[PDB]
Subunit: 356 residues, 4 copies
């Protein structure tokens, strides 16, 4: 089996099947003569290879991947066990979407196999969670969850967006399906939105012909698929740099007097979350002071991003409501990019002093 | 109000807000800086322009026509609600209803939209959505949208019309009373068969809900800015292309109606034609095999002429009786007449018909 | 032979050769395995078909097409006969570019065969001109020029940008090569820059392997080539509308008191007229336009307008402008595809504001 | 001054000037409203200028577009151009079968030998053009030294920096006047676009833009390709680091193989200054061994280019120069067993395995 880097650049493609083109031609065509799109097929095969899965499916967005998958596997009466902490729109989709169509939802600490097995019911059909989780980015025992899951043949779905198949491969640990917001690290350059699902040919075929075909129509543009593949070609190199930069920044943040503590890392790629002693006011001043980090909500970009939930995404909520969603007043999340670490340290240092 | 052609080229865009660029820059970016309080311009422009063409208040762009339909229905319906559908629908749409949302507690009921008497009789306190294509198979008969709208308001039912076949250039359901219009922009709107996309147009209130609920939470069927830019490029020639599609189809239809191999012409709806081959399924296969200009494919609204014979193509797996149940006769042939020289199209059909014998 | 519209949509392509794709896949690859780019090849073959020529060549821009062609055909000592009036960038290329490398240039009235024949010398190798020409868009006898060129086997090159192969095909009239700024009508949507050269395989091969390969490197991106082919698919329909709109606007402008006369028209959707009020009227006219865009180009879906004296040639003096065939009140319009009633209304109010 | 990686990702762009977009919008428009420049091209140019330490940049349709636009601008009949002993195939063709046929005098000189260069300087010398490093051993030239001589008659020094990229070498900070790049290679890094870049003083670049490009080549770069090039530049430092590491391991391996006569370049660790991920070696078995070696490769691609994520290999004698005779090839610096490799970003163990088996098959 060729190495990860080799497969991320070559898997599934041979120039002679496409006129000798070194780079695969982009099949920007809505239709083909009556007897699949070669560009999407290649992306799917390559992502399947990287995750150690049998088949892949490309979608218009990470949400397209999650919804197409869940709509396929669940029906009224079925139960879904969810990790305690989820993205945002995922939490919304579950509670304000599919959850309002008869599907039962139950949040459980995936870190406690005792509680998980205790929450297992003959109606449980799907176990969905992200690894690691937002809190302190704890890994969670995927193999352990898989063991409990098969009690009622429950399908285990893991959101592997944060790690990418380069750092974690849930399928090799027992998961049935892995989903990605390829919009983040996989693309790596913040210019496209895309989603990926990988698992057995059996499950993926169902999601493709049911969830996607009939219930979401969340198809991915061949042009975007081509750009996503371009990004995947440097995945290993980018993740290495994201991790190194984040490690240095995390160690720096831990020594600063303005920082109460570091939620993570203690590695979640280039992600960091820390707490400002000064709370919401300190967070606002910190964000206003940044000159290199961008004030935005996303991650996995070449550019470093920063967000202060309390004054940004969750500014409308009250302090108590924020706490209920695991959002402290001084919580700051960073997607450390690929810039020179010395410039990133200087930016954070200056902003930290300005936060006072 | 500026003319249709003018709005299809200019509506919603002013070069001054984008560096003086004659053609709007493509915002191929997944994210924007977070609002200071102290949306993607490419998608917003496409949405505003399509809203203008349909005479609606707001527009929403989706990854595909199916993305538009599903995002809309997931938003408006919940378990217990009822949806009245036209008797004949698109394949995937039909499937989405019965094999998709229909399996989540939503009741579906098929009724002849051309029969207002029957429609009114099918209205129940639970009816929340009335969905149909106009025109619809098998004879592309234009349903009375204003009449349906009158009945719908009896229980505040939302009327949704699939306007793919006509495009806003030939029909504008919202101006006739519909609440929402959906499009597979993959067809005529794009016009060049290189992109897949969907559009929903209606009131700001309804579109906002579909955007923030059906799309944001239940489908994630977002449209790529690159594809949106291409769709807008296509819309710039919509009037001219539809004019030619129609002219070519009229000539081919008249020709087909006089040929010995043709039993009848179902229709004439843009450049769409559907006719019956006396020879049935075998004649259909030979006809399809003989075509040299028309392409054997399943779609429509492309610059290239397309042809399909359902019985030996999309519905080849079904039995003759099952096909009939789905409005598919053994000799049914559907044509999406393109923009090629009509003399070349006539010659291709003529020789194929002779070969069908 | 299939009709023009049919060839503009299908010529040179068969889905079977590319995975059954209805639309040709875009070969956005800089390299191919060691034994031509299928996307560029297709564009070239299709343009050759539309012009009635044997071969085509795609370039990064119209200027790329002209320079690549001339650098190939000329060498120090050779003479080039040029039309009395050219684009602008071309005129500069000739005089401030290739002309400073030993190549002799000589302007001649292509409409005057006697003068052209009299300007023919044993050193003449290329006869280059636009048809129609800027002045009053006078067609000019291409077959006549071709007969004279033979005298010393001179190569006749015609810039067919204004007409497009849909309205004029110089090769079928005797020209050796045709060049295009595909940036204009061929693309039709103002989103790409590109050039095209069509002629015999013999000539195009030389231009491809000499002018382009060695002297300009003006290659066209497969992405742009694909967009250009997308545009060509509606060429006949767009040109029909450009022409119809322009005819109506031309008739209107002729009856307006603010207009001295119409230089032209038919040159596609192009119109040129003179404002009685000179440069001041021109400036006010341009400032008032709300639909037409103040820009320098043509062949776009959007209508464009320009007043040379206050725009491209504003730095020159009135006498210098005249030397370049630019009058103080000259206004050029590239009539687009918008609703003619909206275009008439915009021009009408602008003309009243020009006073 | 921000670090290289920071500038390669951010230089010249502020989201607030473009609707807050994190990624710059692509200005795919042929024209703009008449005033009272394309932002996408301008950004690419400013960023490349920053990376090379130059004042201004210019983007072209191809590396050849960059070279021709530059030379057409700077030379006129009677002028003399001093060239490096060995030049890139097409560049050599442009000089001899192109501009060289328009009254411009050409003359090759060993740039590594300042004595010969200084002796080759004439009152007519206007341009000194060369690649650094250059074949056959990829030896670095003393740019500062060449610059000192050039000033004798105000000759403009132009350096093709394609092989190194501004990440590994910056000729302008060494005295060069202009640097040109075939961005088609390393800068893009993914083999999906063709593009050229020129960086130098605002004065020189303005002239090339308004004369060579505007009037003599028309080799403009598509905004779409410019955007892709910028996307590629964002990982330049990381890719070059891997290209270099992979090439070093493969070079050491090749140096120990019985089928290999010698390694032209790179030359051990620290022929100094590794030529990116480029390697050239000689096969003892000549043209026959070269053909078999090439036929056997299963991971490396048989193609003519470099700087791609995918590893490429070529054997000139049986590929680009197959029509020539053995003596003619020698005249062009091509040995019968010469093999050039553009080592890519794949797993080094897979690359080693491929070369290993192809080498055994070459016997």
């Amino acid at each position: 089996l060729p190495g990860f880097a080799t497969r991320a650049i070559h898997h599934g493609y041979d120039p002679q099947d496409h006129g000798g083109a070194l780079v695969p031609p982009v099949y920007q065509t809505a239709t083909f003569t009556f007897p699949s799109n070669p560009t999407l097929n290649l992306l799917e095969a390559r992502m399947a290879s990287l995750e150690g899965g049998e088949a892949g499916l490309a979608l218009a967005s990470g949400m397209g991947a999650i919804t197409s998958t869940l709509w396929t596997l669940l029906r009224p009466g079925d139960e879904v066990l969810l990790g305690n902490t989820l993205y945002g729109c995922t939490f919304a989709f579950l509670h304000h979407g599919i959850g309002e169509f008869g599907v039962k939802l139950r949040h459980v600490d995936m870190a406690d196999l005792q509680a998980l097995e205790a929450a297992m019911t003959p109606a449980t059909r799907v176990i969905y969670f992200e690894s690691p989780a937002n809190p302190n980015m704890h890994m969670a025992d995927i193999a352990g969850v898989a063991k409990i899951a098969r009690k009622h043949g429950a399908t285990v779905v893991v959101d592997n967006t944060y790690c990418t198949p380069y750092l974690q491969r849930p399928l090799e640990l027992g998961a049935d399906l892995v989903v990605h917001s390829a919009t983040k690290y996989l693309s790596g350059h913040g210019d496209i939105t895309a989603g990926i699902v990988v698992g057995s040919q059996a499950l993926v075929d169902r999601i493709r012909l049911q969830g996607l075909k009939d219930m979401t129509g969340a198809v991915l543009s061949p042009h975007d698929a081509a750009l996503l593949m371009r990004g995947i070609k440097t995945l290993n190199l980018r993740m290495d740099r994201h991790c190194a930069n984040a490690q240095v920044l995390a160690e720096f943040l831990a020594r600063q007097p303005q920082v109460e503590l570091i939620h993570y890392p203690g590695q979640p790629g280039g992600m960091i979350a820390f707490e400002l002693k000064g709370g919401i006011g300190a967070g606002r001043r910190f964000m206003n002071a940044l000159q290199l980090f961008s004030r935005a909500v996303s991650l996995g970009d070449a550019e470093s991003l920063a967000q202060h939930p309390a004054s940004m995404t969750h500014s409308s909520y009250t302090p108590e409501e924020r706490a209920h969603y695991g959002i402290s007043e001084g919580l700051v999340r960073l997607s450390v990019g690929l810039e020179d670490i010395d410039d990133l340290l200087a930016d954070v240092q200056q902003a930290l002093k300005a936060s006072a």
